[PDB]
């Protein structure tokens, strides 16, 4: 079979392309999600191999924008639909698609690519490093009272339709995400996918429901997305809770936790430092399971390092090795702080030796460079450099998982 | 008719400990009671006695804890906090803690530490959760390391407790200056930590000890673990693994993971940033459950803040409120960095308002001050203060739980 | 917020949709449509915020069998919900005052409410008066005692239409001796026999059995659903009744000897279901007892005079009604097997109790003596509680009617 | 008033099948009823009708089965054996089977075959369990092969049902002469075997087809399987329906394809042979659990012809005193002389060597049950020394019989 | 420094066995170690010692096994195969097995046998799985027999170990000539098999013994089992062994266990895959049957081993045998065998079948068909028709079964 590397040509090609990706993951095509995700799909970013009659490998990317530590919003390739047919494994198709993709990503001005760890077929390859984690939070709602000093405010709550939700939630989201690195901008089209009452999740629980929190003056200041799972021990499956101030956030959670016929609540994909964890008076009642979320592939190292901000002053020379794309290998001087950042090639002595994968892992402040060094994955060349750089690459607010893609 | 008093003699000690186990619905563990007597100070074991039996207890061990920066300071290790079920909610627990904190203050100890598993006083009296632990587990067949992990030329021997105790203290003493939260281990504390307790034999099996030797014969790592034979589901329950360099640590874990007839491994009480988590190539194969470990009660706030070091420079004024011990309330100027730290009463404008409980929570660098502020528990009074203070109160190495007490 | 009743059919479906939504469920369209046929819109009250319903409380006009066989009108309260954004604001209490007042003005002396209406469990003077049993076990372990006469009867699996031509007459014949059961019009039979999608997913399509005497007379029936194996095939019995002991036992034996069945379940049976005593080895038939029907007495003197009593009783009851204080008072009850009267008196009181606890003992399913030993009922003169407890009992325990 | 009759028309056919599914506590599977109609002969589908509904059923398909030695003989594939619960234990099952067995012999079929899952007549009427099946399962990561197993240079493609049916029949036809118990598959039987039944979609997922190609392009192996995506930890499963190959390399390579598939945790093959080659390819047998259970029951209706139609693992000259309780006209004393290349059977007056029932004779007929074990159990009686041992070996076969496609 | 040596004295023995249990993640079973010493030959227990503890072990018992055809030949019962986890993949297992197999051959033992539960060397060194066992289990209420099964006039008695040991050996000795794979049981081996081990007491209960008597008083059957009391009601019986000298005593003894009052479930681990109980039960689906490996065979003297057993039918085949671990056994062998004869010698005639010594061992006890190994690609047919004839001859009408544990 002669394989052709090409992009999606038309709409029937798109549906066949997406059908093959679901098939590799042992799943039927989710037609409702395929239709709503088409609205922000760029066909010339959806590449793959075709054997003349079917798609045998895929790799796509969405043009998105991600918040960096410090609040800067930079373009990012949201990589998705990474599959190879099981009949075509270990034949170079994944490598070829990824080489073409990273080259196209770099030419578009995107300094990095981001990829959910659940894209298991390329986990930990090609320079992708796990940079963000998520927490699954769960527990009995009767055991999740808040600490008494938590102010709930004078707010009110209303369960509303999707249309009403989408008229207020975007403004709330836009206001909070500058302080939540890892979150991504949501156009109207991305909100449509994020709030879709997908058939897949209805079967797991129930129809999606939307809540809005109002200040006393009527201003929308919080929202929640969740699904009920009636008893078969009724459960609430929370998709997202956000608020522009601590009272609306706490009041919205208190609303979900005080619902009468509910026994258990679950929030998959929360931040490992979700404020809910610290509102609860008795932490052992709220289980916290931590796992991978987002992998980062740095594609333009100097621009990426210069675009984010750093928790403290740092002046360090990094000997960066890029095994997959050796043209990115080089020795860079990083000068950064809270309000400034620059990165340039230098011939001075290197302070730290590390790979582009490990550099990507620490880029969002969710993985300590010091721990990678203590593990033997990163090498300190001059005393005190790793400790100072680890603090600077960290951030007081942990990165969190964006909406699924 | 109740008397507040300390333990008088050896029969009094055994009755005292028996009542503590009884409150927790357990028979007295004679082997643990016997070995822990060797470092028990009777005049630090207080309680209520009704004339014929003990009805409430609260004890403390004189220990020494590593702070962020490596300084080892004296600390009261609070233990045996019980109240009889017929005397609950009558003020006995509060009275015992007032006397205990006063004695701790009178001994010059700037802080007390308390395991969160002391459920009867969880979150009371100004104690704040400052350290977490992770339960790590998974199928050993799925826990291969990343290929760049150097295992070194080391060798391993399974040894008796006596042989283990001839090498493990020197290894432990060398690594803990970089592991805040760990406590000094005298010979007597090693005897308890390495006790082949009957309780844990029933959960799995007899304790076993491993030593890792460098090529020159130098002991550089150790492991404590118990096997749980199949009931094909044989498990290893790891109690502790440490090494003085990345190679010995990785080689010792590889030894446990490659052991024949082993199916599953479990490490309860690891660090949430346990080096093993980043050695494993496929993170989803190693489940990570995060929970409370150590609560901190600051007893001398200025001295405690001046004893630790800070991840970056900080100059912040803290308005501290102590509800339980109002004599500690006041306005303190903290000036600290990597190599210096001072804390003093000041009349300058306050930057941050918080309780002594929340101050204790961030004290070991395991809880972000920024998250406590975003939750509404801490109040920022002047712009930018919390972010700078949160970074400084953090640490590149997360604190970890010491040996149980 | 506006307190009002249902206006039309679009208002009705939105009203019912909100009730399911409060209970975290999608609307069951098939059940909503079939239940409309016995719904009176002016008995369906709720709160409306201008665009949606935020609270509901309804009632069906039904008739229930009392101890002794008397059939009295009763309000079958249903659809008690409040939106989660409007909880703890008095809406449920307001609706219940209006409903109980309307119930009293309609001449209904009492209200009945399934305990599964968890949102108002144990409030407003409702007391648990009837229990139900979930019976289950392996069919191969449920042989009957040898003296059980199965008779000469025959069985046929038949369609719903044929079932509805004979089951009402069988039902109407057995319920005079089964307190707690309610009359079933054609509309209620239509709901009771609905092949609901909800229950199809739990098991399978509804099936109907008729038991015929040797002369051809239908004398028993069964409603059940199969749950094929996923060996562990189950039968989910909804109801089995017979006009004589042979038809009842023969119909159960039919279900228990079915070839591919492993386990059987009867949820909502009587705690004194005769099946429990036909089985030779009781431990093979598990019996889990739980609340079924709550009673709210609305006109106390009329209610006690309508039922009959297992033995003679002459007692003075000091009744306290916290929710509806107009019913509070001191009542003299004189009752027996064939007579019953009740009126206000000024004589010395023998027993002090609430209307809730009075409602709990009203159907003979809860012993007044047990309520007294617990401290909920207070004896004022010696020996009164024992005599009243026996009289308020009944040789046949009350049982749960068809769901509403 | 009950009438024993055959299916009359198409509405009658659907009511007949509807009653059979109802007896087994199931709704009618419309898709399976429709595709199985294509090889259903209405005059072989008998039952009892009370004037308004079917109250008992028993059917038979005209099929052909491979015997030890490779001979393909006509066989009655008995199916749809049901009785209404209100008419059980009244002789209806016995009557239908008497009529069916008589009809089977007149059609030239020397034997009938019946899946053990037809629980209503398990072990009755002279049916004896003659073939077993194995449920194979395990973690795919633990199922590496022995290193000396040659996978060959072959290639694999996941393909549609239409393309699958263009190559799979030829592969099947080539291997089954060496797999006693397998049945010929016409296009109509392939259509049922490859149906993406709604029933099995709910248990796992949509059916999938794999073809193995040699280096020259020749199709030499195939697989039918269904994915069961994950639903605690990850646990995606593969439910294998069938894997066959014309050579050891295509067979092993096709299994290696299923076992190395990404995102798979567990694999299951229900209805495999108890001597499935996969069991011996796996390096670590304890990783592949093997549960053995009944598969096919055999009812011999023409005893002399049946023994003369199969071949025997070694030479045998034995006199069998056969007792047939249900059909006493088959009772008699038969001399069997058979081997690898010859077989004959006729009534004889010589002294009998072995006494046994036709049920027990049917159990050993396919080489899946040792005649020696039946004797040690007390079910078969040896009349002259050494007879059972020689007859047991000859009635055996180096390849165990295996379950055919479901019917 | 490591030393390869045998056990020197009794304290050395207990330290040796302690290390073997430790490798298998277990505390030493003192009661089993004591009773098994009585038939342990110290000079057959080899291992590696580092100067202060044992770091590797491999032992062998001198036993005798019944072959297809009834011949009872000496066999090495290999046991206690361990290596410390700190000494893995350094050649210790290979060295111990080279020395052990060489000693086995010099002692006149034509083969070695090894339980598959010795997981550390599963499938290595030429050992091939030759025998399987079945775990049989089900609800006793569902296990009625076929009606034509004659139970006889026998009687049953629950007896003490001493009373059991006065009759069980004679019953056992009478049935095993027809049960290939079973091994002779001296008094010392009976003592281990009937030990009321603390390990099995914890899994269920104290061992119990049953004897079946004919009408004339003759002991004709026995059973070994342990009760597991209820902990829904669910008391279990764990059967260790049931044997009878005739079909009636076997069936009656099983009927006794299945009709025992207050029992819900019965389990027989380590039965034959052709255990007679499977065919007595009227409804096979009520008796679950899980088949797994039992005994591995290592042929060390190929010509004598092939000549010592008998074959189900005549065979004249030339075997090209490859022995990778012990290449001195590699060669081309002509096997001529039948029901009453067997001979084997090296030949230069054309080979008919090519196979390894491991696969040859797998088919040796009649529990694995050579034809299936050939269809799997593990065995190669060189001339047409050879495998089919050889497979039948290597089979046997009675399947091999697992002996008592060692």
Q: How far, in Å, CA of C246 to CA of C220, rounded?
A: 9
Are the C-beta atoms of B286 and B277 separated by less than 8 Å? yes
Coil, strand or helix at B94: helix
Q: How far, in Å, CA of C192 to CA of A372, rounded?
A: 66
DSSP state of D145: B
Instruction: Give the phi and the psi of residue D346 in degrees, each rounded to 5.
Output: -155, 155
The sign of the torsion formed by the CA atoms of A170, A171, A173, A177 equals positive
Are the C-beta atoms of A59 and A97 separated by less than 8 Å? yes
> Do residue A275 and residue B371 have CB atoms under 8 angstroms apart?
yes
> Do residue A262 and residue C24 have CB atoms under 8 angstroms apart?
yes
Q: How far, in Å, CA of D241 to CA of D227, rounded?
A: 11
Indicate the residue of C155, C156, C228 with minimum beta-carbon distance to D26. C228
CB-CB neighbours of A21 under 10 Å: 22
Q: Is E227 exposed, middle or buried (0-12, 13-18, 19+ CB in 10 A)?
A: middle
Q: Identify the CA nearest to C44 among candidates C63, C34, C61, C57.
A: C57
3-state secondary structure string across D341-407: CCEEEEECCCCCCEEEEHHHHHHHCCCCCCHHHHHHCCCCEECCCCHHHHHHHHHCCCCCCCCCCCC
Q: Do chains D and E touch (3 or more CB pairs under 8 A)?
A: yes
The residues facing A380 across adjacent strands are: A352
Q: How far, in Å, CA of D31 to CA of D195, rounded?
A: 8
Are the C-beta atoms of C159 and C208 separated by less than 8 Å? yes
First CA to last CA distance, chain B: 30
First CA to last CA distance, chain E: 31
Rg (CA), chain A: 22
Are the C-beta atoms of A63 and A32 separated by less than 8 Å? no
CB-CB neighbours of C16 under 10 Å: 26
H helix runs in A258-374, sequence order: 276-279, 301-307, 356-362, 369-374
> Do residue D262 and residue A28 have CB atoms under 8 angstroms apart?
no
What's the CATH number of domain A1-131+293-297, 3.40.630.30, 3.60.10.10, 3.30.559.10, 3.90.1580.10?
3.40.630.30
Q: How many residues does chain C have?
A: 404
Tokens (6 digits) for B403: 């040996």
Mutual angle of helices E10-23 and E30-37, in 10-degree steps: 130
Tokens (6 digits) for B29: 């563990």
Indicate the residue of D155, D158, D205 with minimum beta-carbon distance to A28. D205
Unique residue bearing structure tokens 């006790």 = B195
Tokens (6 digits) for A129: 């490093």
CB-CB neighbours of B147 under 10 Å: 6
Q: Identify the CA nearest to B67 among candidates B11, B126, B130, B156.
A: B130
Q: How far, in Å, CA of A402 to CA of C332, rounded?
A: 72
Residues 6+ positions from A87 with CB-CB distance below 8 Å: A56, D155, D156, D157, D158, D210, D257
Unique residue bearing structure tokens 């040991």 = E165
Q: Which residue of D has its CA nearest to A53?
A: D159
Q: How far, in Å, CA of E308 to CA of D393, rounded?
A: 20
The residues facing C112 across adjacent strands are: C76, C295
**For residue D296, what is the enclosing H or E element?**
strand D289-300
Tokens (6 digits) for B13: 């000690």
Q: Which residue of E has its CA nearest to C285?
A: E232
The residues facing A6 across adjacent strands are: A48
DSSP state of A148: T
Q: How far, in Å, CA of E275 to CA of B174, rounded?
A: 63
Half-sphere exposure of D123 (CA within 13 A, CB side): 12
Are the C-beta atoms of A113 and A299 separated by less than 8 Å? yes
Q: How far, in Å, CA of A198 to CA of A31, rounded?
A: 9
What's the CATH number of domain D1-130+295-299, 3.40.50.10490, 3.40.630.30, 3.40.50.2000, 3.60.21.10?
3.40.630.30
Half-sphere exposure of D284 (CA within 13 A, CB side): 16
Let me know if D122 is a catalytic residue: yes
Coil, strand or helix at D201: helix
Residues 6+ positions from C141 with CB-CB distance below 8 Å: C281, C284
Q: How far, in Å, CA of D79 to CA of D57, rounded?
A: 9
Q: How far, in Å, CA of D58 to CA of D49, rounded?
A: 12
**For residue D4, what is the enclosing H or E element?**
strand D3-6
Q: How far, in Å, CA of D217 to CA of D212, rounded?
A: 9
Unique residue bearing structure tokens 């599977």 = D29
Mutual angle of helices A11-24 and A31-38, in 10-degree steps: 130
Tokens (6 digits) for E52: 């202060």
3-state secondary structure string across B14-59: HHHHHHHHHHCCCCCCHHHHHHHHHHCCHHHCEEEECCCCEEEEEE
Q: Identify the CA nearest to E6 among candidates E49, E67, E51, E38.
A: E49
Q: How many residues does chain E have?
A: 406
Beta strand B72-83 with B111-115 is: parallel
Tokens (6 digits) for C261: 């069945």
Tokens (6 digits) for A197: 């009452």
Subunits next to D (3 or more Cβ pairs <8 Å) are A, B, C, E
Sequential DSSP letters for C199-254: HHHHS---EEEEEE-TTS-EEEEEEEEEE------EEEEEEEEESSHHHHHHHHHH
Q: How far, in Å, CA of C219 to CA of C395, rounded?
A: 24
Tell me the CA distances in angstroms from D225 to B85, D222, D259, D270, one per residue in order.
61, 10, 12, 11
Q: How far, in Å, CA of B263 to CA of D141, rounded?
A: 13
Beta strand E353-356 with E315-322 is: parallel
Q: How far, in Å, CA of B268 to CA of A109, rounded?
A: 45
**For residue B213, what is the enclosing H or E element?**
strand B208-213
Q: Identify the CA nearest to D301 among candidates D118, D94, D106, D134.
A: D106
- Contact list, E339 vs chain D (CB under 8 Å): 389
Q: Which residue of C has its CA nearest to D28?
A: C205
Q: How far, in Å, CA of C248 to CA of C226, rounded?
A: 20
The residues facing A46 across adjacent strands are: none
Q: How far, in Å, CA of D77 to CA of D182, rounded?
A: 12
Are the C-beta atoms of D100 and D43 separated by less than 8 Å? no
Q: How far, in Å, CA of B387 to CA of A311, rounded?
A: 8
Q: Which fold has domain B1-130+293-297?
A: Aminopeptidase (3.40.630)
Residues 6+ positions from D110 with CB-CB distance below 8 Å: D73, D74, D75, D300, D301, D302, D305, D306, D309
Indicate the residue of A147, A376, A387 with minimum beta-carbon distance to B246. A376
Coil, strand or helix at C190: helix
Q: Identify the CA nearest to E69 among candidates E362, E269, E331, E313.
A: E313
Are the C-beta atoms of A364 and A131 separated by less than 8 Å? yes
Q: CA A97: distance to chain centroid?
A: 22
CB-CB neighbours of A243 under 10 Å: 24
Are the C-beta atoms of E100 and E58 separated by less than 8 Å? yes
First CA to last CA distance, chain A: 31
First CA to last CA distance, chain D: 31
> Chain A residues contacting D, CB < 8 Å?
24-28, 85-87, 89, 120-121
> Do residue C85 and residue A157 have CB atoms under 8 angstroms apart?
yes
Rg (CA), chain C: 22
> Do residue B229 and residue E88 have CB atoms under 8 angstroms apart?
no
Q: Which of C12, C121, C144, C323 is catalytic?
A: C121
Rg (CA), chain E: 22
Method of structure determination: X-ray
* Alpha-carbon torsion angle C223, C229, C231, C237, nearest 10: -10
Are the C-beta atoms of D81 and D58 separated by less than 8 Å? yes
Tell me the CA distances in angstroms from B157 to B252, D207, D312, E85, one per residue in order.
10, 53, 61, 9
Half-sphere exposure of C223 (CA within 13 A, CB side): 22
Q: Do chains D and A touch (3 or more CB pairs under 8 A)?
A: yes
Q: Identify the CA nearest to D255 among candidates D286, D298, D223.
A: D223
H helix runs in A177-245, sequence order: 188-194, 199-204
Q: Which of D21, D122, D213, D326 is catalytic?
A: D122
Tell me the CA distances in angstroms from A348 to A353, B108, B146, D272, one per residue in order.
13, 49, 30, 68
CA distance D263 to chain E (A): 27
CA distance E396 to chain D (A): 7
Sequential DSSP letters for E55-91: EEEEEEEEEEEEPTTS-EEEEEEEEEEEE-GGGTTSS
Q: Which residue of D has its CA nearest to E133?
A: D290
Tell me the CA distances in angstroms from E372 to B358, D176, D248, E378, E388, one per residue in order.
71, 14, 11, 9, 10
> Chain D residues contacting B, CB < 8 Å?
141-142, 234, 286
Q: Give the resolution to one decimal, in Å.
A: 2.2
Residues 6+ positions from B239 with CB-CB distance below 8 Å: B207, B224, B225, B226, B269
Residue E270: which region, alpha, beta or left (left: phi > 0; alpha: psi -120 to 50)? left
Half-sphere exposure of E1 (CA within 13 A, CB side): 2
Q: Is C289 exposed, middle or buried (0-12, 13-18, 19+ CB in 10 A)?
A: exposed
Strands (E), C21-86: 45-48, 53-65, 71-82
**For residue C14, what is the enclosing H or E element?**
helix C9-22
* Alpha-carbon torsion angle C366, C372, C373, C379, nearest 10: -150
Q: Identify the CA nearest to C87 among candidates C46, C55, C124.
A: C55
Are the C-beta atoms of C342 and C331 separated by less than 8 Å? yes
> Chain C residues contacting D, CB < 8 Å?
154-157, 204-205, 226-229, 233, 254, 257-261
Let me know if A123 is a catalytic residue: yes
Sequential DSSP letters for C147-188: T---TT-EEEEE-HHHHHHHHHHHHHHHGGGSTT-B---HHH
- Mention the CATH class of domain C1-129+292-296: alpha beta
Q: Which architecture does CATH list for E1-130+294-298? A: 3-Layer(aba) Sandwich (3.40)
Q: How far, in Å, CA of D23 to CA of C207, rounded?
A: 12
Strands (E), E260-349: 265-271, 288-299, 315-322, 331-337, 342-346
Q: Which pairs with CB-CB distance under 8 Å and at least 24 residues apart come from E333-339?
A: E333/E302, E333/E303, E333/E306, E335/E306, E335/E390, E337/E306, E337/E307, E337/E309, E337/E310, E337/E311, E337/E393, E338/E310, E338/E311, E338/E313, E338/E314, E338/E393, E339/D389, E339/E69, E339/E310, E339/E311, E339/E312, E339/E313
Q: CA B166: distance to chain centroid?
A: 24
Coil, strand or helix at B325: coil
Domain boundaries, chain A: 1-131+293-297, 132-292, 298-396
> Do residue D86 and residue C254 have CB atoms under 8 angstroms apart?
yes
Beta strand A112-116 with A73-84 is: parallel
Residues 6+ positions from D237 with CB-CB distance below 8 Å: D204, D227, D228, D264, D265, D266, D267, D268
Are the C-beta atoms of D258 and D238 separated by less than 8 Å? yes
């Amino acid at each position: 079979s002669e394989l052709t590397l090409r992009t999606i040509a038309d709409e029937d090609d798109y549906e066949s392309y997406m059908a093959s990706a679901y098939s590799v993951f042992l799943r039927d095509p989710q037609k409702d999600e395929i239709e709503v995700n088409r609205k922000f799909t760029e066909l010339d970013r959806m590449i793959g191999f075709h054997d003349g009659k079917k798609w045998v490998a895929t790799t796509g990317a969405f043009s998105r924008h991600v918040v960096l530590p410090g609040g800067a919003v930079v373009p990012v390739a949201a990589v998705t639909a990474v599959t190879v047919s099981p009949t075509h494994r270990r034949r170079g198709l994944l490598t070829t698609m990824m080489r073409h993709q990273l080259a196209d990503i770099r030419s578009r001005g995107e300094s990095l690519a981001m990829l959910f760890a659940s894209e298991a077929l390329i986990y930990g390859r090609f320079g992708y490093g796990v940079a963000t984690e998520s927490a699954e939070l769960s527990g009995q709602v009767r055991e999740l009272a808040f600490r008494p000093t938590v102010d709930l405010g004078d707010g009110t709550l209303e369960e509303v339709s999707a249309e009403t939700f989408l008229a207020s939630a975007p403004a709330i989201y836009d206001a909070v995400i500058p302080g939540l690195p890892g979150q991504m901008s949501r156009t109207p089209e991305w909100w449509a996918s994020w709030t879709l009452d997908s058939e897949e999740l209805q079967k797991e629980s129930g129809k999606v429901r939307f809540v809005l929190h109002y200040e006393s003056d009527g201003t929308a200041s919080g929202f929640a997305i969740y699904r009920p799972k009636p008893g078969w021990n009724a459960e609430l499956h929370v998709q997202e809770v956000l608020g522009t101030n601590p009272r609306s956030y706490a009041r919205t959670w208190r609303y979900l936790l005080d619902m009468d016929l509910v026994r258990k609540i679950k929030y998959h994909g929360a931040s490992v430092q979700e404020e809910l964890r610290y509102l609860v008076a008795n932490h052992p009642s709220l289980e916290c399971v931590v796992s991978d979320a987002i992998q980062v592939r740095l594609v333009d190292i100097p621009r990426a390092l210069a675009q984010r901000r750093y928790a403290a002053d740092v002046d360090v020379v990094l000997e960066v090795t890029d095994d997959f794309l050796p043209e990115n290998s080089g020795r860079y001087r990083l000068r950064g702080g809270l309000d400034h950042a620059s990165c340039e090639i230098t011939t001075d002595d290197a302070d730290i030796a590390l790979t582009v994968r490990d550099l990507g892992s620490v880029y969002m402040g969710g993985v300590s460079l010091q721990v990678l060094a203590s593990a033997g994955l990163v090498t300190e060349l001059r005393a005190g450099a790793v400790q100072r750089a680890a603090t600077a690459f960290g951030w007081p607010v942990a990165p969190s998982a964006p909406d699924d893609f």
